[PDB]
What does this fold into?
Amino acid sequence: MAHHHHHHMAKEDTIQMQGEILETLPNATFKVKLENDHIVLGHISGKMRMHYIRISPGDKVTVELTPYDLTRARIVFRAR
It folds into this structure.
């Protein structure tokens, strides 16, 4: 196939996007609505989430999403 380009992506760029919890889910994942009205699923990684106070609807929180994986995210609760 003439000059067939290899599907091998480079330069990973993840984006921290900040909004508020629209809905709490017991799936270790929280339905977070961002300031753009775009709702993304911010998932808490690690067993810390069980010990951590589950983030109630109406709490503002940051998450981190690859623009390609916009459907999902990882929670970014800013701990010191």
